Design a protein around this ligand. Sequence first.
Ligand SMILES: [Cl-]
Ligand SMILES: [Mg+2]
Lengths: 243, 111, 240, 250, 222, 231, 244, 241, 235
Amino acid sequence: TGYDLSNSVFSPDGRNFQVEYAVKAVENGTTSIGIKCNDGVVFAVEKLITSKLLVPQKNVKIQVVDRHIGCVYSGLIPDGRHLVNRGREEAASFKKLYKTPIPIPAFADRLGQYVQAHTLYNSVRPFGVSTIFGGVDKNGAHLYMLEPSGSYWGYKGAATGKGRQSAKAELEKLVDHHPEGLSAREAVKQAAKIIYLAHEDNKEKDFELEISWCSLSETNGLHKFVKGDLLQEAIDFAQKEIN
Amino acid sequence: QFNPYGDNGGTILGIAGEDFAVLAGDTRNITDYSINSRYEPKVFDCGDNIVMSANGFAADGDALVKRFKNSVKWYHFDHNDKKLSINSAARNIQHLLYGKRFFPYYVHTII
Amino acid sequence: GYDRALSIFSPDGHIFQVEYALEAVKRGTCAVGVKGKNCVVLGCERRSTLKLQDTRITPSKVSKIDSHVVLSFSGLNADSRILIEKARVEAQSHRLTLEDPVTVEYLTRYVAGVQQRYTQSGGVRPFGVSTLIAGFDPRDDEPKLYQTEPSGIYSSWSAQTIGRNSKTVREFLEKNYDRKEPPATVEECVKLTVRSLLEVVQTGAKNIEITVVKPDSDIVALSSEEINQYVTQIEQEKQE
Amino acid sequence: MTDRYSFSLTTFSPSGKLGQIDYALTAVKQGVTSLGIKATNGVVIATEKKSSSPLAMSETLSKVSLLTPDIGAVYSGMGPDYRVLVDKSRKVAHTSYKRIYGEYPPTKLLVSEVAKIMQEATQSGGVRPFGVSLLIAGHDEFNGFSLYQVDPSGSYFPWKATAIGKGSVAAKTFLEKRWNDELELEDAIHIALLTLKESVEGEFNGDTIELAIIGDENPDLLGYTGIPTDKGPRFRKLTSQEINDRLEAL
Amino acid sequence: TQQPIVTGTSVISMKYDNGVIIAADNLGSYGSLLRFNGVERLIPVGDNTVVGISGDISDMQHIERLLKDLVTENAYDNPLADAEEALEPSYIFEYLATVMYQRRSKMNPLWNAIIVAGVQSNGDQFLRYVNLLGVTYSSPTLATGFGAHMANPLLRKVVDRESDIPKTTVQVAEEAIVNAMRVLYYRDARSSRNFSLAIIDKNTGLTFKKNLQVENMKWDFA
Amino acid sequence: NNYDGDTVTFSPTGRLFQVEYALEAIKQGSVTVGLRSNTHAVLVALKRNADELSSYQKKIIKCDEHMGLSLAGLAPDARVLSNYLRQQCNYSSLVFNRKLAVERAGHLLCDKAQKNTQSYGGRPYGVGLLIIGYDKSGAHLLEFQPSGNVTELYGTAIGARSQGAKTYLERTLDTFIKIDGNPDELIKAGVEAISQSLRDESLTVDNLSIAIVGKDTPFTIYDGEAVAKYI
Amino acid sequence: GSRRYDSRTTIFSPEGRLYQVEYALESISHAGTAIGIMASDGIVLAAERKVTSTLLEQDTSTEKLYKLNDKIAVAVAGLTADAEILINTARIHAQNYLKTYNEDIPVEILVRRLSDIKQGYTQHGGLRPFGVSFIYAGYDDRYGYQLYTSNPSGNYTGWKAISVGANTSAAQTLLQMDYKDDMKVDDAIELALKTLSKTTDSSALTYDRLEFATIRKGANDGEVYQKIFKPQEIKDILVKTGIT
Amino acid sequence: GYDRHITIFSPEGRLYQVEYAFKATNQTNINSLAVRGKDCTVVISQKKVPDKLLDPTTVSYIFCISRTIGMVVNGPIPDARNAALRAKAEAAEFRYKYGYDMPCDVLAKRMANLSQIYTQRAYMRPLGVILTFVSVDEELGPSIYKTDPAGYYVGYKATATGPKQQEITTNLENHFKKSKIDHINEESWEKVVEFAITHMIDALGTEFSKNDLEVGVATKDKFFTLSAENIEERLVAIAEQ
Amino acid sequence: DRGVSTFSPEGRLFQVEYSLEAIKLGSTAIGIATKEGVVLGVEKRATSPLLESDSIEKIVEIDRHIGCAMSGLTADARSMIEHARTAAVTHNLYYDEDINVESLTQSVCDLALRFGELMSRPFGVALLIAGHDADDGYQLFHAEPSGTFYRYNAKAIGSGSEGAQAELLNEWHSSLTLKEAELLVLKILKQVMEEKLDENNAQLSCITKQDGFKIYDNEKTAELIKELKEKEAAE
Ligand SMILES: [Cl-]
Ligand SMILES: [Mg+2]
């Protein structure tokens, strides 16, 4: 034994235990999700209200990269911010040289290679976050989810955090019941419901819902936060479904 | 060939009284035979009861005043909000100027 | 580069690498320094476990740092060369910039500074060397004798010894050296230095080295026969 | 990141042993047998092409490698370590010699450069020793024909004939009985094939054996004519057919 | 150190009672060759700022990309990016002025003269100049190159000092700007008939006018 | 246990023990309170002395005319982080002629602390910070943890026995948020909050440290007889 | 991180000894014995090759005796590969000195330089020391014929006669017994071979197990000649001295 | 026992971290196969999409390294993409420096050399992947060259990689023992793909739908991957005889 | 082993806490601040009678208006003193004035936590920094290897510190004269020292606005010791 004391060490199984321990930090975090719709993507996250003293709507979790990509993550929040800062540098250099905004699959690999690099050496620690991200490019909508190992795939729907099992089951129902697809406005409503349903794993404290979206028809392919009336409409729809 | 310097004209005047001091300057800014501005302030209140003007090449003038104002700010941070005396300010400005001895601020400074 | 902190504090507030460097000094051959009224004498032990040695070419235990200052040591021989070289370079650098040779205290302070630096720099171990630095300041006739150790502390001594069995010879010096009246001549000072080593040495043959430093860059090493005459006279007075 | 292993991974144990070098020699011992024999008018180096799979094309894996036109090399131990050493040896022959003197290095000096590289992997920070022993055969104008062994420690020795790897102890005894200072190159090849048969279990033919010689200049392999002083390489790898022809006279 | 290759001529501007006006023609000259005829030299930043640039066009395109990147960067982790924490004309100018002076200090200037025109959060007019030397100044009217010699005298007849600004309407100001552009077309050999004009008003916001032409020209007397 | 030797090692449950030990240093520190209204933001700090001959360790540091913080834990680490904030506030003013937003200041502090939690050789910061400020979106209060977690709040407290002050602020939330245009009453509420964390000792004239920033109020620190009015 | 795997090659023991230096000296004690003897008219270097083979090409082989320049040679005991690294550095130092001063490097200055390089590896860098002990045989016009030794600690000393490698305790006692100051090279040649013959772990001392060299002013007039003995010449001197 | 944590020799002369990297290679539970035709080189690999929430079009272990070179990977996707990016960078740099397209065997050697370095340098871990490079080389013709975590590489007539490599390998061995030639004697690549799929079905004892496979084909001057509908056409032809 | 910058479970840096133990083994140093000046005193503690005690330098001048006393591994103090002197002189060069005592102390304390894997370990020495400036008058600071510095009316460091500090607790008042402080340092040093206090094994110094920093002659201190003996025999 001792194989789990140092990053980048293969166990006799062929496993990197330090990466597996980073996953435990992700599983300990709040629930975040992503839904791929007809012409875009929707991101939503559970924000635990630890105290009344937290200013509502102020501690924003979802982050924008460039002007067309949204990112949300569960686990160690600072690690997620570090990853997004790198993503912003990657997107800037891509646009600087190639003029066009970074395509989503291209951006996905940039994050992937960077996270994977933190599993190659014992002088660094793996990322303690799973990141759900995506947006609209010239080939349409894309949704991705990226793990501590550096592993990522494209998704129809994605979920991570403490209530991921609940969320995944809900996402699977939507995929089955809508083979033709989901509209952006429908996806916002559904995202609100799924976070409310996934909040059963975190039922002790109450929470605040945060939603964002990129849609070709609804936001002109730019990332925007769901605010005011549209947010309240989604909260009402969600509260109706849990009762 | 690129000439990093220019001449923005202007004239400044400092006079020390018995218990007061004045620093005056015209408000005209020029290049060659043209007027850039009829009112471009050239004498500045830098805090701690110190007034300053760096006349000549206005870009270097603005840069120096800006760096001195900053030096006053950091003097307060580093030395328990102690007032920067005029003699201490003068020695500090010498080091700001001599720091660019081989690529000078093309200005005549008066505080 | 290799950056590992080798010299670190232990729970009881000790730096073991510095303390273990002193143990290397304890193992080294005995060195002794005695200052008279107008001279300083440096005595050194030569272990007679090594015969068939070529004494002409073998590194001598006392080293000139400048024409007016000398350095002897106890501990790791290879380590001492690095300190001696640095000191010699600094001595010439001082002459070049100040236009005056180093004082004995300044040279001591420098060597001690180098030793200290090696106790809180990454990737290095302390010197396993203690030194005795002796001489006369330029245009001064007051004798100077200083001691340094691996930790980097230094101080002035009327008489001092370092190395193996230095506890015994310090015992001798503490009861035989009078401060109100130091050895008034070269003879008396050399005699007291040879006497102190005879408490520890074994045979008074090629086991004792003696170097005399006088004011105005007057430094000379005594030969076997000259020292042998001191060894002879000491025991003939002892047979009584 | 940054390579933070700036310290030696090979160190002296209380008994005076350098563990990592000993263990590297153990890896060489497990390796397939290779040998070298020096004759009056040439040198031969040989080994078994132990194919990992019958679907693998073992001709694409070269165990015997040209270092210079007059110098060749074979190994026993870890193949990948050998391959990179061949790359470094080829380059150092140019950078530290041919680009300075306008001619290829003599065998002993190229061996010296390879040895230095292997020594440094035994002392430098954050690396393990190379897990190979090399046999280097060559010719140069002033030293004639020569054969050298280089070990993981960086130590090298000149041989009349020797063997390394799996069955080296038995092979060296076999070579001691057969070697003399009057052997012609064809005699050395014959002895090489006889010696190598003892350590080979399965098939023994031109497709399972790799064999090269350092001998006469080959003007037919030079690629150009017109310069009298340039007469072609002395290193030549024997073909599958050439080996089988000598296995009938075995 | 370099030399300008493809260049843009005068940028002219002035303050009026409720905001600022800025204008510049659509030509990219290659020495005396009138090479490129569809170059936009007024670049809006948000809905409160217009940056007018003359001089080297390759450096202008670089500055245009810096400003585009500035908007992207300001929006990062900024919930009030379209409200209280939006870019101000004063922020945009100070950034450019920093860049210009730094570049001249490395003896590698951006070979331009720039006028930043806009309206601040509190409704205050903003109009300030910066060039390849890092020299900055403000005035009720500002103009670069030939505009400094020919436009300023005409524009100063409308607003001669600070107290004339509240007395000057947007109609009078635009009229003065358009006339100045005609005069520059008569007399500047590196000018064109086609130009752009931008009005930034504290009430009606940013009005950007493209494909304007110099008209009502006199020649006859020849 | 076997996983607390350095900051580069996760435990089997996904914890970072060196960061948790750095968090423990804050709990040993002296109590400090932060609270705000819509016009002003206030810091109150209980200063700690070594003995009766010693001075009381300062707790509040000014970062700009519109921003500053209070500390709990390793004081030298607060000096490093406050120096960094001073520079970032200064960079914003010099380059952009723009006062640094309090929320952006929090993001910068988060990222600076994070780098010390993912790399070998380094250590986490051993201090907690309460940042108050007044910018273009009004009054603000932030809580910084050396884990990197920065949180915007109406009120809070950190240090030893901070739980008493935090519960009080949670009760008084609806009252003190409405104290607009009255600096003295907002400070009173903060002094009453920090009093819920005292045991055996009480607030004296060299014990108490107060800071305030607001609409027409530069960040100013009150010590000595300037806080006797509130005792 | 990486600290976990660091052996810390440059630390003191509680007794004030350098672990790696001590263990490197243990390694050297298993190397073939090398002997140096200084006479009034020259120096002798004699050394035993380690258990050889009949197939080893002896006449082109060198593992013990190396030329540093025309005036200075070394005998090696320890890791041969480590020794060659240091030898090449010493050869360069000698040439640097010759270029700078237009005079051949004095023996001690070369010895001090190599010894300082060894010392460095024991104090900084975190690398293992060189597992090598040298005997330096050389001549210069200041001190004449000189013998030195250096070991992995970087410490060096001067000698009239000295041994390194295996059985140095037995060898040094035998040398101490028969050495005299007025000795000549031909007498020293005999002493060196007799000492190796008695201390060797082999059954008998033969030419193929030896490397031999002399530094003589037996060079025609006011100059010095180095002689690295050939296999046949070692065979002849073994018969002459009556060992075979 | 730190000789098991970093790439230094064990007392037996073994490198355990290399051996354990070989074990990580089978973590995906995917088998791949490569064969050569007259004019082409075909590589097939199992495709498993276990989650319904996944976008199946993004799940792939076949990579287009250059116009001419394709690469299939056996091992975890993060290490696979690491190797893919590097191979693409190396191939592009080669063409820029030397003025011609990087050969398949030369790229394999280069990636093998990089892998060798990870087995010797302590600060770098081996990649837990086996890389099979395929092309139709302009000098050597149809080419298969495979690299592993030990830094070993060699050319193949045909090859197989994965948990059930032995079954596929023996099946391929038996076919080439019959035919006595080093390739599939077929004109069209379509039929070479059909051969490859048929013999994987025989060896594994499992049937495949269009979504259970992933196919890459190398021809002169281009490598390309087949769509699900191209594979379906292949499966239909196999079933119809 | 374990990092040099590691936190304990209690939230303390191991190396800093261990260096504090080394300081406890150091010779005693005492400082007393008055409105007439600050006094600094030290125990010399020579290891042998042959050691010339006036070569023991544990009280040091930083500038004309700032002095400093040390306790612990005194070799570590040399670079700290060098930095302090450079900082004092540099500030005068930049600002044509004396540097504040607090600012000087802060500059020294900035070095403290610059260790890791910069120097390889913390300093093993504590400093008493005493001085005068126009803004805050006579001041005494205690600079630790933690990077923390406290201002004190009076302070003792070294092996006899807790006994001495209890004594300073009782004796200090805001009306002490310079002469009263001198005798008080001598009295408390004599209490905690192993050997009997005299002018050769103890040293006094002071900083006043008029005369600046001064180390006392052995003859001057010897008189103050005689004055102390008589006033203690006076009741
Ligand atoms: Cl390569
Ligand atoms: Mg490795």
